[PDB]
Amino acid sequence: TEVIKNFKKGFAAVVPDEHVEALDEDKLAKEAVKVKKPAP
Amino acid sequence: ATLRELRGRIRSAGSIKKITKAQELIATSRIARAQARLESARPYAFEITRMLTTLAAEAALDHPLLVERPEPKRAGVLVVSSDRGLCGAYNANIFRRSEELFSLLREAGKQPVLYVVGRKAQNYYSFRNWNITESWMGFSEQPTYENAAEIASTLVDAFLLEGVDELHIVYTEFKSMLSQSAEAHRIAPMVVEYVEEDIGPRTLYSFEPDATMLFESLLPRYLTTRVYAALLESAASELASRQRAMKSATDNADDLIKALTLMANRERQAQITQEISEIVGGANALA
Amino acid sequence: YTGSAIAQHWMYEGKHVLIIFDDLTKQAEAYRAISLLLRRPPGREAYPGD
Amino acid sequence: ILDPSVVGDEHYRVAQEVIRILQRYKDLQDIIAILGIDELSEEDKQLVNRARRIERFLSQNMMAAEQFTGQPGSTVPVKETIEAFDRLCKGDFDHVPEQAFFLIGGLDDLAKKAESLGAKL
Amino acid sequence: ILDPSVVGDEHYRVAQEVIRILQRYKDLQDIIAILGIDELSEEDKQLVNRARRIERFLSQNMMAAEQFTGQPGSTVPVKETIEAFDRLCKGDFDHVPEQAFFLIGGLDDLAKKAESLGAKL
């Protein structure tokens, strides 16, 4: 038992890329405060 | 021993078929209830939207939740998923849209920060070694406005600060009961678009105490009612997806019952013929 | 076999023939009948070996 | 002769890994037939994707099949086969669609078909 | 002689309840294997836990099997058996793990092995 336990200390026991292309920025819906005052 | 085996398989497939048909009908009832909830929550959202635009008409648009922060370094994405898992490609479509969003964010120097709603998102993201900032579970089928308030409070507190430059939500939009589409929305910072004039000689609104304080006190309520509407649409979409997936599973179990019954009858006939062959072979060996 | 003989006569004379066997399953069943009546030991599905 | 002392260590290891993945896929086939792939674990989903791609990449356009389809044959050396299937069972192609592994030769044919299908290796 | 007129009313009632629980479990096993246990009711999950504990408590370390498990045998009187399975079917040990029911004798052995796994009853 002690030989095993003293060996165990000497024993030497990342997000995958998924290669998914980027979403179209035109598809990212934007919550907007629709001001009805013209000052662009 | 294959005949007992085939009869047992037929029995098990019949049990599965019954269970999945029951689940499909339950999902029909529950999608009715979820559509009820959605259309009952619509009016307050409409009214707060029109009150917010009335306020913004005469406000100082400088609120942090309304300004585009220069040099965006992080982005907080809230992915809305389900708890129960008898739906179809519902969570799969959610995760595909969230991966597309993460790629769009990495293509702009922004490190995505991950908040999740549901256990399936937790599974998908812990298997992929993501570090989830905060999770929410137990209300993906009957979400209450308190859950939306809590989620949106956490998100806006992460925005105004460890800190993010914008907030996105990946959730399923429900429409027409035959198409539920995973969608990425950017909920903060809100884009200011000056649509029209609409009213020129219009009776001016009185604000109490003032327009700017009301606007900055109403904006987070608008964000949280948006998150509430998102949770409701996601619940309805999940129930629709579960109905569809359970109908598909029932049809698959029925076709499997048919194939197993054909095989069982085939081997039954084969066993009778082989037994007769042995009996008549012995009887001929004796003659 | 009668049909194929009538057709082979034309084939071996330069003609082109088309033969249709409405059902060979029924020929197989009739041959299995004839075999079992001759007390020949059956095989798979009680069909003869040949 | 599928023996480490005949074909080598890498040949035998890649073959055993392919067989293990396909056996796990066959074990899951029942659930997959009734409920689909969406109900499995994430590990099992990854393994089923790898197994579908592997069972399609074992297919090949044979020299004698040119009379049926019109596409010529393909020869793949054994070292290239071992390398390709090592990359498959390691997960280096899990992004390429299920098709484009269908009826091809080595890795160059895979690259050509994936780039014709909008993918890369 | 499994008759209320021979073995008594409580013996017969406990035996019939055990048989009913095990039959319901055998009926649910296929659903649990395909769709998962979380798809059942709460009544059915309760019954499934009880049925697994019951089917493990019917096993026993026999005297003639010491040669196969190294463990000495046990003997349990019929009244202790009746009362133990009554408590199981009622649900008095639904907090003890599935082990500690496996290859033991009476209720004292159950307590010993349950505490050996960090639990009480």
UniProtKB/Swiss-Prot annotation, chain B:
GO cellular component annotations of the record: peptidoglycan-based cell wall; plasma membrane; proton-transporting ATP synthase complex
Which keywords appear in this protein's UniProt record, sorted alphabetically? ATP synthesis, Cell membrane, CF(1), Hydrogen ion transport, Ion transport, Membrane, Transport
Q: What superkingdom heads the lineage?
A: Bacteria
Key word Membrane present in the record? yes
Gene3D superfamilies in the cross-refs: 3.40.1380.10, ATP synthase, gamma subunit, helix hairpin domain
Q: Main subcellular localization, coarse class?
A: membrane
Entry keyword annotation includes Transport: yes
Q: Which Pfam families match?
A: ATP-synt (PF00231)
The secretion signal range is none
What molecular functions are annotated in GO for this chain?
ATP binding; proton-transporting ATP synthase activity, rotational mechanism
Question: What PROSITE patterns does this protein map onto?
Answer: ATPASE_GAMMA
Q: Name one GO biological process term.
A: proton motive force-driven ATP synthesis
Q: What does the UniProt entry say about where the protein is found?
A: Cell membrane
Regarding the membrane, this protein is recorded as: Peripheral membrane protein
Instruction: Return the NCBIfam families for the record.
Output: ATPsyn_F1gamma, PRK05621.1-2
Task of the protein: Produces ATP from ADP in the presence of a proton gradient across the membrane. The gamma chain is believed to be important in regulating ATPase activity and the flow of protons through the CF(0) complex.
User: Into which family does the record put it?
Assistant: Belongs to the ATPase gamma chain family.
Q: Which PANTHER family match?
A: ATP SYNTHASE GAMMA CHAIN, ATP SYNTHASE SUBUNIT GAMMA, MITOCHONDRIAL
Subunit comment: F-type ATPases have 2 components, CF(1) - the catalytic core - and CF(0) - the membrane proton channel. CF(1) has five subunits: alpha(3), beta(3), gamma(1), delta(1), epsilon(1). CF(0) has three main subunits: a, b and c.
Q: What is this protein called?
A: ATP synthase gamma chain
* Annotated source species: Mycobacterium tuberculosis (strain ATCC 25618 / H37Rv)
Report which gene this protein is encoded by. Answer: atpG
From Swiss-Prot, chain C:
**Lineage, uppermost ranks:** Bacteria, Bacillati, Actinomycetota, Actinomycetes, Mycobacteriales
| Family that this chain belongs to | Belongs to the ATPase alpha/beta chains family.
- State the oligomer form and interacting partners: F-type ATPases have 2 components, CF(1) - the catalytic core - and CF(0) - the membrane proton channel. CF(1) has five subunits: alpha(3), beta(3), gamma(1), delta(1), epsilon(1). CF(0) has three main subunits: a(1), b(2) and c(9-12). The alpha and beta chains form an alternating ring which encloses part of the gamma chain. CF(1) is attached to CF(0) by a central stalk formed by the gamma and epsilon chains, while a peripheral stalk is formed by the delta and b chains.
This chain belongs to the protein called ATP synthase subunit alpha
Provide the protein's localization: Cell membrane
Q: Which organism is it from?
A: Mycobacterium tuberculosis (strain ATCC 25618 / H37Rv)
Role: Produces ATP from ADP in the presence of a proton gradient across the membrane. The alpha chain is a regulatory subunit.
**Superkingdom per UniProt:** Bacteria
Curated annotation (Swiss-Prot), chains D, E:
Q: Which domain of life is it from?
A: Bacteria
Annotated compartments: Cell membrane
Q: Which family does it belong to?
A: Belongs to the ATPase alpha/beta chains family.
What is its biological role? Produces ATP from ADP in the presence of a proton gradient across the membrane. The catalytic sites are hosted primarily by the beta subunits.
Assembly and oligomerization: F-type ATPases have 2 components, CF(1) - the catalytic core - and CF(0) - the membrane proton channel. CF(1) has five subunits: alpha(3), beta(3), gamma(1), delta(1), epsilon(1). CF(0) has three main subunits: a(1), b(2) and c(9-12). The alpha and beta chains form an alternating ring which encloses part of the gamma chain. CF(1) is attached to CF(0) by a central stalk formed by the gamma and epsilon chains, while a peripheral stalk is formed by the delta and b chains.
Name the chain's protein: ATP synthase subunit beta
In its UniProt entry, the species of origin is given as Mycobacterium tuberculosis (strain ATCC 25618 / H37Rv)
Report the gene name: atpD
Interval of the full protein contained in this chain:
366 to 486 of 486
